[PDB]
Amino acid sequence: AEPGIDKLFGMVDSKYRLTVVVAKRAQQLLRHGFKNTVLEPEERPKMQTLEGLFDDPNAVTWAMKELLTGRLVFGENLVPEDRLQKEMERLYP
Amino acid sequence: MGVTKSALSTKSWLSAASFQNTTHVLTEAAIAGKKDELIGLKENVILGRLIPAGTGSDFVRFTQVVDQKTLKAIEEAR
Amino acid sequence: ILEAVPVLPPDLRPMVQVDGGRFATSDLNDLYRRLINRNNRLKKLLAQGAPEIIIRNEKRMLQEAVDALLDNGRRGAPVTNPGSDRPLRSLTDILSGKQGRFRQNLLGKRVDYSGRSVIVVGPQLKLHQCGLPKRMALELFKPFLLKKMEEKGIAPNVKAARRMLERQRDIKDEVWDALEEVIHGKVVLLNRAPTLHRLGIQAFQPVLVEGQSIQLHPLVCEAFNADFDGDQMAVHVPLSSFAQAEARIQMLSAHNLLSPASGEPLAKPSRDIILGLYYITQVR
Amino acid sequence: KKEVRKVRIALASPEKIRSWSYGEVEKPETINYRTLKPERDGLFDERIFGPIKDYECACGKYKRQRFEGKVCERCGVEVTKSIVRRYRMGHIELATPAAHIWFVKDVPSKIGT
Amino acid sequence: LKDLVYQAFLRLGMEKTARLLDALKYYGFTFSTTSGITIGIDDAVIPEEKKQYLEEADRKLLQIEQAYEMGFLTDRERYDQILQLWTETTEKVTQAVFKNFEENYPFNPLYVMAQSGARGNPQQIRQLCGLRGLMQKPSGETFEVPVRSSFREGLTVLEYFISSHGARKGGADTALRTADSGYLTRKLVDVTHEIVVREADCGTTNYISVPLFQPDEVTRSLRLRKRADIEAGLYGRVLAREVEVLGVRLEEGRYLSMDDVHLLIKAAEAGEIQEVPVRSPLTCQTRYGVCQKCYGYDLSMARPVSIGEAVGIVAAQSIGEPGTQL
Amino acid sequence: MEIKRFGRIREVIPLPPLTEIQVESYRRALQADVPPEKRENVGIQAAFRETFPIEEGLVLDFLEYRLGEPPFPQDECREKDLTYQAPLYARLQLIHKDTGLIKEDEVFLGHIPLMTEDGSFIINGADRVIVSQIHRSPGVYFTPDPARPGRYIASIIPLPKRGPWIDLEVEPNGVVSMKVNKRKFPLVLLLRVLGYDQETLARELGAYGELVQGLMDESVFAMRPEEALIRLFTLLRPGDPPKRDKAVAYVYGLIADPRRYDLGEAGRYKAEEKLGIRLSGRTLARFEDGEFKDEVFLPTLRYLFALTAGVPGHEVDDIDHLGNRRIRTVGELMTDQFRVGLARLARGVRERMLMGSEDSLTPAKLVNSRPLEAAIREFFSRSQLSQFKDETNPLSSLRHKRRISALGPGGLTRERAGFDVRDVHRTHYGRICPVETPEGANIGLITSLAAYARVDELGFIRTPYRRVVGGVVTDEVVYMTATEEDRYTIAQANTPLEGNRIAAERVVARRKGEPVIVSPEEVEFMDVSPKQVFSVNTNLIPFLEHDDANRALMGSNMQTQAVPLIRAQAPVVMTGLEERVVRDSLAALYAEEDGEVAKVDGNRIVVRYEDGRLVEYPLRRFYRSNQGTALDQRPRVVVGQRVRKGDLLADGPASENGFLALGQNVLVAIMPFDGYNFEDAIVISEELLKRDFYTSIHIERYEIEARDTKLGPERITRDIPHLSEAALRDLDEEGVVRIGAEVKPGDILVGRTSFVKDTSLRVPPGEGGIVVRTVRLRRGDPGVELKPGVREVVRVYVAQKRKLQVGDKLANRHGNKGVVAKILPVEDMPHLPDGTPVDVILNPLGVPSRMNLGQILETHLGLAGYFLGQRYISPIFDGAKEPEIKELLAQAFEVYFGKRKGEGFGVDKREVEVLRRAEKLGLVTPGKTPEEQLKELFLQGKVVLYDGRTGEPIEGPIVVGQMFIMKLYHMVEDKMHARSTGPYSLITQQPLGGKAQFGGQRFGEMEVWALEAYGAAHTLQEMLTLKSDDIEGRNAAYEAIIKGEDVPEPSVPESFRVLVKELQALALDVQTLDEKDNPVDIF
DNA sequence: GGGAATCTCTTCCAGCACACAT
RNA sequence: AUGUGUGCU
DNA sequence: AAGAGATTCCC
Ligand SMILES: [Mg+2]
Ligand SMILES: [Zn+2]
Ligand SMILES: [Zn+2]
């Protein structure tokens, strides 16, 4: 099993929608610094050697645990193509 | 018509170029400006492009996701 | 009727040194060779003299020499001088055939990051996961492990980490712990011998298990019809974060609990399980 | 033009045949045994096809990336990696027209019909 | 167990069913080893009435045989006679194998396996304790002398030989078709790779009526369609017009769960509806592809089929997988 | 140790020398034994005179032939890539039409492979063997007509391929059609050729069925003596009517086209014994004065009418009655190829008469050395029929020779016709095993010969049958043919007998191949022993009568791949064939003559023959098998002991004191255990490793060649140009690594360089091990082949001993395969009340669905075997039964329990609990004392067992006992793949190579459809390009992961942009339009 | 102008292995 | 790199 | 190699 996937599949129209959402989320979450997360204070994924999952082990786990809360919104067209790419690299390292 | 007889004559020449006699599927389709509608999987796989289904479906392929921290920044100069 | 002959790009026809000094050139260079030989012999010819036999015979030779380049095997069979009676692989052959550019991706291609071994029952693990021997986990996930070895005090830089795993006795605790930190949520694809239906390849989370055989969960056997009597299975790693994302969502075993063919559970209790349950739930 | 949608095939005119070509293979020359460099404007010449090397040109007037899309003043060498070598086509101007055996030899003669 | 996993799948979810399944896999093992279930030579308890089921058979044929020698029945007829005798006899002894357990040895290590979903088979257990039947000759005919012995007791030399005939045939019937596993999925893929569910709904309203009655079992007699068949023709489909039957009104264009079909058959028994209107790929408007409503349910789970699924390949495979079983 | 036999059917005759089909056939296939003037015309010699007098002035003649002394010995050919052949001399003279007689004896016109005393031929430095072949025997036959079950057709097969295929059919109209080659014509005309009057014909055929009116006629058509020839030629060979037909006479005559199968053997005996009456000469020709004569034709006609009419003694042939299908043995294959070559030689001598100068030309002008060489060389190395000798264990090697294959030269069996041919016909009984057929595809097309069965020159299989005098059994063994067997009533070997007299009013028997119960008078023959039904492997399976035919097959087929264990035990329950198997398979070494022992070394055994002779015996320790296993001969007698003639002195790779040791005897408890024995998986005790139980020795042979290139002469030296001395620490010899060194995946085995970069030989990603032998064939080589261009070869034998690890494949004789799942330590393993733990745990769920209760019994007897320390011999169908096993168990129980009851211990509380539950179960009898309850349980093979990891007794008694389990030839280290990124190829970018990586896994259409059906487009495309062929993106990802970034996707599909170019090479144009039709760049 | 016969071209199947051969 | 053969699935 | 389709020849 995975972090509440039934909530995730129901969360979208098609099952593939969820996959693309999660994927792209992970991508931007890794490319523009792992800081642009939407649940980093206390309710966040952790690991077992140290609690150091707080930085950058897995990309997808984060995306799935994030979507679980109403912090992100998917959809067809939301933001202009280039502008998004620009500002998402500006606001973060 | 039979299943193999069916698939023997798909419009998309890209597909028939693999199974059927290639030199023929190309010679015959060349004389008539045949638009290969890149839709069939087998057809669209010979090239490399993501298969037109699942995570590659147009209905899903073009989707974005953002948070409010960026949504606001974009919201301003809109 | 083409009066200009399009020549293929270089590397698509590699004139390459092999070993000792052997040179493998794709037969295409050899074909393009005689083409120029006749062509130039034709253009220069029209300048000096112009005999009918000479020039006409020349035209025929050209028309044939270009056909050789296009579709070899329709008129005799142009051969490299006594050493190999084989016909030179023409441009037409570079496409048509089992090993061409049409039947190419459809059925072939050997994957890179991968492996295989003998399947074994995997009692002490869940559907979500599978048992994959240490050596494999290390080899398959080599570069990830390199970078994570750099992130910590396991190796100075990338190269030092590359040399760090060179000999088989270097694998210390640090490297293994790192190797656990390089997977966590990552999943691998396990492939059956004859792949038949959709549920013929599943995604499991790798567990670093000792032994040398792939450990596989009991319940997902009847899916891709596997028994433990010599069977083998292959393994891949969906590298891209996108590939990972889709793999652990739509290709993960615990998510595919019903057969696309019919609304029946295909991960139902099988042999031993049912026995054990039936034994305790009957009256005397 | 950023999204490839569908793909059409058709016969190509002499002009179109030459449109993809960046020069004429006016020699049957491949590679010298001594210098593995290309020969006499034949099948491997950088002028028509591409720079045998990476980003470096023929002689060496321009040698790095800073001037990525520039041609050398004295010899024609525009440079990406050895990819522009493997991507660019050249051609051959036959003295006498010749027909495509594909359209000649076929179960239905594409020309005899 | 299977039905339970299915119901719990649609009631508690998918991720939950995972945990449930693994719990079963655990406890089931753990108890399968405490149980002390094992196969001993005695475990294959042979029916007590064996000798009599044979006796009454022998003393039967003794008469029948004589009827031939006098000139009553013909060659064909007696050939069929021996057939009926032994076919009835074997099937009769089977009942003895399975009943003797249920009466005097309820938890028989060989019986609990064959009874539950463990390894075991009715006519197979009939061979360990009861006797093997008549064997197939090398031709389409059968030996008039059945292997009158069981695998537990000494199966005699000659019997083994008249058994090997069919024994080797089996190997052909399986191992030859082990190569044909990539043939039908192949031919079916070549034409179905273009089909995919990339639409929400189509502008059409064409359906078909799946027969809940079979007109052709006897010469021409209409009756209840097979329990199994109907389920595969209605499960997870979409109606074309609202239909009320047992008392509840089935929504128009609704994704039918299995129970929908259940009460539909229970309604068909009382003579309510004869057929059911249903959307199908057979009548989709989408040139290349099928729409969500027209396809139906299946999505490795009981959910509305996701928009974008490669249903062509999936179906071709679904038809290809059990091709080798035929 | 010791034994207790059970078999009570007195084996009247010992089993034949198992390897005779390969040996005797070959010995008879050449006159190298007896002088060139003696008998035995057949074989090579025959082949001579069939194409020897090549009359044209050209008349050669068979003036004796001799060879036999090989270039190089048995072992030396194995080390130096050679053949155990012999230079073919043969004495050959020429006689011209005119005067003058020039002769020149010996001509090196080729070589010829000999055979070891075991049955193989070392070809090209590799032990190979040519199996036998079954095929329809050339002769006259009568089978039903395809479309009409009313009339029948005749058939006259004559091998080889060149040679007609005659069929006689009575056309429904009435006329009888002669079918020659394929074409048809009035047969009456050919009847007229031979000189048949309408009257005599009317007589002979008219005899019965009126059907003669269909042929006898042709008044206007058959009123011409010699003209039938001239007319036949016109109607058969479109051309000119002179004497060409009178010459074709010979073609459907003798010498040429028709079969040269002697006057008496194949054609004769088959024809007569089946149909017709007479054969006058090899085939149909007698031409005293140009005229014709015939014998086979007219009986053929006669028998045809007989069948298509009344009942002149039931005339029906069965296509695959086996009494119609010969068996080309090895010598027949060899001799046939020899004939084929001789023919080509004769074509050469036919050609050369034109290139002659004067008269004499016997030696160097006519007879050449290319045809014969072509015949004999190609065969022993290209024939589908000759293969690698399967030498996993001695038994395997033995079986491989005793096998019969249908697949052959194609003129007899194809590979697109089966299902019906594969079926066990009736006459395979005693002749061919109805079990041995290798499962999987190609099943039925291969069948091993039965035990006692043997070929009788003529080809057909004969079975040993004990005839009987009315009521009493005769001690005469008649070997009957399949066709002769039907003509009798034979009883089974289980029938009760008083010394030699029948003692049962009703006797089980079998008439023309069917179960019939008769009286002691109608018995005429009797099967020797039930052991004659099955091939030897099946006969190495105890309690077979309690196994399914399907399981028994696997059981019989498992032994062929049983790896020779260093400490291999004999089966605790065996059949008796073991002792015979080791000796007949030439596994171990025995004594040749009585005497005492001189010197028992680990390399020799010297024997004290009374005749003042001590003959030297080698005892060879580590000789690499053809498969990879290791063959070791270890001594079994101590110095100062008197041995007898025919007694063992040493053991083979798979023997224990003379018994076929193909595995281990392990105390098995059959019960489910957690999930570890799920499906067919097997649980195993750690103890089995602590005492080297399942340990093998595999010797991997590596090699390198020294090709002398012109761009740079390669050579082997102790020099590796670039980096370390540490890697050269093992390099002892000047170029060769030391013997006894430890090599590991990546370690340097050989040192050599080419044009200077290192191109040496290192140890593959698999595993090295410990070096045992280093063979080096240099330039100054005292008589070797050596590959062209190569100067010298360096072969290294790297051995290693492998223990039983999780993942290895284990199985038994009854046919239960199963890979090892877990090796639980001794403490947490199910153990008896005695301190003794169990070795192997086998799931009971594997039993009922396969109906092989053989394991169950082997285990049962195995219990008593364990506690009495005495193995057993239980013959196939006359071995041990329930009462005997149970009775022995009662005996062992007294040891196992008397020890405790005596020592000061009694019934454990746990035992009592288990008994209490067993009462409710139904096993024990309610009432008895706990001791007697335990007795009742022990009788049933079952015994109280403790969980081991808890102490809690397993509630419910489980059957335990030692069974025979063998480690199969598969291992896991032999098959282990795990490479992420390594070498590729210059010609194809798809990843494979064995430097530091194994090789990339194959990703077929089956897998691609799976990915597509999942809809995992990203993964799939990533799989087809990024990780396979797309070089441009491969390095992208490889650079991405190193830095830690996400894997970049391929923007422009590589295999697409390349296809664009490959398509633009022609006059074709691939336009990549946009969404609304507009050109789009790709580069 | 149609029908039949003959010749030529194309299809040619699930996975890994180990072999050898060309 | 293709064919033959066998082994396992 | 076997089967299917196309082409050519004869009626
Ligand atoms: Mg299996
Ligand atoms: Zn320059
Ligand atoms: Zn639709």
Whether residues F296 and F158 fall in one domain:
yes
| Alpha carbon F832 to chain centroid, angstroms | 43
Q: F782, F697 in Cβ contact below 8 A?
A: no
Q: D27, C21 in Cβ contact below 8 A?
A: no
Q: C188, C140 in Cβ contact below 8 A?
A: yes
Distance CA F613, CA F668 (A): 49
- CA–C1' gap, D107 and G5, in angstroms: 20
What angle in degrees, to the nearest 10, is found between the helix axes of E14-32 and E2-12?
150
**Residue F223 main-chain phi, psi, to 5 deg:** -135, 50
Q: By a Cβ cutoff of 8 Å, what residues of chain B touch chain C?
A: 17-18, 21-23, 42, 45-46, 48, 54-55
With residue F283 as reference, give the H or E element that holds it: none
Least Cα separation, residue C110 to chain E (angstroms)? 19
Final residue of a domain: which of F302, F318, F334?
A: F318
Residues of E in contact with B10 (CB under 8 A): 191, 194
Q: Cα of F450 to ligand 1 centre, how many Å?
A: 29
Whether residues F377 and F438 fall in one domain:
yes
Whether E307 sits inside 8 A of B52 (CB atoms) is no
Two tokens, residue E58: 């022998």
Least Cα separation, residue B70 to chain E (angstroms)? 29
Nucleotide nearest the Cα atom of B5 (by C1'): I4
Whether residues F792 and F759 fall in one domain:
yes
The contacts of residue E279 (CB under 8 Å, 6+ apart) are: E206, E207, E237, E238, E239, E240, E253, E293, E294, E296
Handedness of CA F730, F734, F736, F738 (dihedral sign): negative
E291 is in an annotated binding site: yes
Two tokens, residue E224: 């209840």
Distance CA F461, CA F430 (A): 9
Q: F836, F896 in Cβ contact below 8 A?
A: no
Decide the pairing of beta strands F325-328 and F132-136. antiparallel
Tell me which residue of F804, F397, F404, F386 sits closest to F560, measured CA to CA: F397
Query: Shortest CB distance from C43 goes to which of D17, D82, D95?
Result: D95
H helix and E strand count, chain A: 4, 1
Q: By a Cβ cutoff of 8 Å, what residues of chain A touch chain B?
A: 14, 16-17, 19-21, 23-25, 36, 38, 71-80, 83-84, 87-88, 91
Instruction: Name the structure determination technique.
Output: X-ray
- DSSP string spanning E215-282? S-SSSS--EEPPHHHHHHHHTT-B-SS-EE-SSSEEPTT-B--HHHHHHHHHHHHTT--SEEEE--GG
Coil, strand or helix at F204: helix
Distance CA E51, CA F523 (A): 28
**Residue D49 main-chain phi, psi, to 5 deg:** -70, -105
The contacts of residue E270 (CB under 8 Å, 6+ apart) are: none
H helix and E strand count, chain E: 12, 8
| Alpha carbon F585 to chain centroid, angstroms | 14
Distance CA F787, CA F766 (A): 27
Residues 222-241 of chain C with CB under 7 A from strand H are 227, 229-232
Whether residues F790 and F934 fall in one domain:
no
Two tokens, residue C115: 């492996």
Q: C235, C191 in Cβ contact below 8 A?
A: yes
G15: residue with closest CA to C1':
C193
Whether residues F623 and F721 fall in one domain:
no
With residue C207 as reference, give the H or E element that holds it: strand C201-209
Q: What is the domain count for chain F?
A: 7
Tell me the CA end-to-end span of chain A in Å, nearest whole number.
34
- CA–C1' gap, E216 and I7, in angstroms: 49
> Would the Cβ of F578 be found within 7 angstroms of any atom in strand H?
no
Nucleotide nearest the Cα atom of D107 (by C1'): I6
Establish, for the pair of chains B and F, how many residue pairs have beta carbons separated by less than 8 Å: 52
Query: Shortest CB distance from B48 goes to which of F1018, F1053, F1073?
Result: F1053
Classify burial at B47, counting beta carbons within 10 Å of its beta carbon; exposed 0-12, middle 13-18, buried 19 or more: buried
User: Strand runs (DSSP E) across F190-331, as ranges?
Assistant: 325-328
Q: F1040, F1048 in Cβ contact below 8 A?
A: yes
Whether residues F451 and F566 fall in one domain:
yes
Measured at the CA of F206, the angle between CA F200 and CA F211, to 5 degrees, comes to 130
| Alpha carbon F625 to chain centroid, angstroms | 16
Report how far apart, in Å, the C-alpha atoms of F440 and of each of E89, F437, F536 are. Answer: 34, 9, 21
Measured at the CA of D44, the angle between CA D38 and CA D45, to 5 degrees, comes to 70
Decide the pairing of beta strands E275-278 and E208-211. antiparallel
Measured at the CA of E156, the angle between CA E154 and CA E157, to 5 degrees, comes to 135
CATH at F348: 3.90.1100.10
CATH at F652: 2.40.50.100
**Residue D92 in contact with partner chain B when CB distance is under 8 A:** no
Distance CA D77, CA F608 (A): 91
Amino acid at position A56, single letter: D
The answer to whether the peptide bond before residue F438 is cis (omega within 30 degrees of 0) is no
The half-sphere exposure of F720 on its side-chain side, counting CA atoms within 13 A, is 21
Measured at the CA of F284, the angle between CA F279 and CA F289, to 5 degrees, comes to 110
Query: Shortest CB distance from F1021 goes to which of B26, B35, B48?
Result: B48
Tell me which residue of E287, E296, E279, E129 sits closest to E207, measured CA to CA: E279
Give the number of other CB atoms < 10 A from CB of residue F610: 9
Distance CA F181, CA F680 (A): 56
- Domains identified in chain A and CATH numbers: 1-93 (3.90.940.10)
Tell me which residue of C256, A11, C221, A8 sits closest to E298, measured CA to CA: C256
> Would the Cβ of C110 be found within 7 angstroms of any atom in strand H?
no
Least Cα separation, residue E8 to chain F (angstroms)? 24
Ligand nearest to the CA of D47: 2
Nearest chain E residue to B40 by CA: give it.
Answer: E194
**Residue F341 main-chain phi, psi, to 5 deg:** -65, -45
Place of tokens 């070509």: D21
Q: Which domain holds residue F503?
A: 464-529
**Residue C144 in contact with partner chain F when CB distance is under 8 A:** yes
Final residue of a domain: which of F272, F290, F318?
A: F318
Classify burial at F69, counting beta carbons within 10 Å of its beta carbon; exposed 0-12, middle 13-18, buried 19 or more: exposed
Whether residues F869 and F965 fall in one domain:
yes
Tell me which residue of F531, F588, F576, F693 sits closest to F3, measured CA to CA: F576
Amino acid at position F533, single letter: V
User: Strand runs (DSSP E) across F106-170, as ranges?
Assistant: 121-122, 127-130, 132-136, 140-144, 152-156, 166-170
Place of tokens 């036919």: F350
Two tokens, residue F392: 């996993």
| Alpha carbon F833 to chain centroid, angstroms | 47
Q: E257, E264 in Cβ contact below 8 A?
A: no
Whether residues F919 and F992 fall in one domain:
no
**Residue C44 in contact with partner chain A when CB distance is under 8 A:** no
Distance CA F1043, CA F1040 (A): 5
The set of strand I positions with any atom below 7 Å of a protein CB reads 2, 6-7
The contacts of residue F314 (CB under 8 Å, 6+ apart) are: none
- DSSP string spanning E119-186? S--HHHHHHHTS---PPBPSSSSB-SS---S-SSS---HHHHHHHHHHHHHHHHHHHSTTSGGGTHHH
Amino acid at position E308, single letter: G
- CA–C1' gap, F454 and G21, in angstroms: 33
Report how far apart, in Å, the C-alpha atoms of F831 and of each of F151, F835, F951 are. Answer: 73, 7, 9
- In DSSP terms, F461 is beta-bridged to F455
Whether residues F1080 and F993 fall in one domain:
yes
Q: F744, C168 in Cβ contact below 8 A?
A: yes
Tell me which residue of F104, F30, F29 sits closest to F60, measured CA to CA: F104
Q: A20, B63 in Cβ contact below 8 A?
A: yes
| Alpha carbon E286 to chain centroid, angstroms | 35
Tell me which residue of F228, F273, F269 sits closest to F252, measured CA to CA: F228
Distance CA E103, CA F922 (A): 12
Whether residues F782 and F811 fall in one domain:
no
- DSSP string spanning F972-1023? STTS-EEESS----SS--S---SSSS--PPB--HHHHHHHHHHT-HHHHHII
Tell me which residue of D26, F1057, F1025 sits closest to C9, measured CA to CA: F1057
Give the number of other CB atoms < 10 A from CB of residue F799: 18
The contacts of residue A90 (CB under 8 Å, 6+ apart) are: none
Final residue of a domain: which of F274, F296, F318?
A: F318
Residues of A in contact with B74 (CB under 8 A): 79-80, 83-84, 87
Q: F621, F799 in Cβ contact below 8 A?
A: no
- DSSP string spanning F830-842? -B-SSSPBPSEEE
φ/ψ region of F119 (left if φ > 0, alpha if ψ in -120 to 50, else beta) reads left
What is the DSSP-derived secondary structure letter of residue F14?
P
Tell me which residue of E221, C195, E18, E175 sits closest to F550, measured CA to CA: E175
Give the number of other CB atoms < 10 A from CB of residue F108: 12
**Residue F842 main-chain phi, psi, to 5 deg:** -115, 120
CATH at F707: 2.40.50.150
Distance CA F629, CA F627 (A): 6
What angle in degrees, to the nearest 10, is found between the helix axes of F227-236 and F244-251?
80
Residues with CB under 7 A from strand G: B 20-21; C 107, 116, 193-194, 232; E 178-183; F 124, 126, 381-382, 388, 440-441, 975, 977, 999, 1001-1002, 1004-1006
Q: F590, F646 in Cβ contact below 8 A?
A: yes
Residue-wise burial string across C252-269, b where 16 or more C-beta atoms lie within 10 A, e elsewhere: bbbbbbbbbbebebbbbb
Report how far apart, in Å, the C-alpha atoms of C28 and of each of C9, C92, E312, F856 are. Answer: 11, 11, 40, 68
Whether residues F969 and F835 fall in one domain:
yes
Q: F1032, F1054 in Cβ contact below 8 A?
A: yes
Whether residues F706 and F781 fall in one domain:
yes
Distance CA F945, CA E240 (A): 64
Percent of chain E as helix, strand, coil, to the nearest 5 = 50, 10, 40
User: Strand runs (DSSP E) across F803-833, as ranges?
Assistant: 809-811, 818-824
Distance CA F332, CA F336 (A): 6
| Alpha carbon E30 to chain centroid, angstroms | 30
Two tokens, residue F113: 């492979």
Whether C101 sits inside 8 A of B54 (CB atoms) is no
Tell me which residue of F587, F673, F517, F583 sits closest to F15, measured CA to CA: F583
Q: E201, E292 in Cβ contact below 8 A?
A: yes
**Residue B26 in contact with partner chain F when CB distance is under 8 A:** yes
Distance CA C153, CA C175 (A): 10
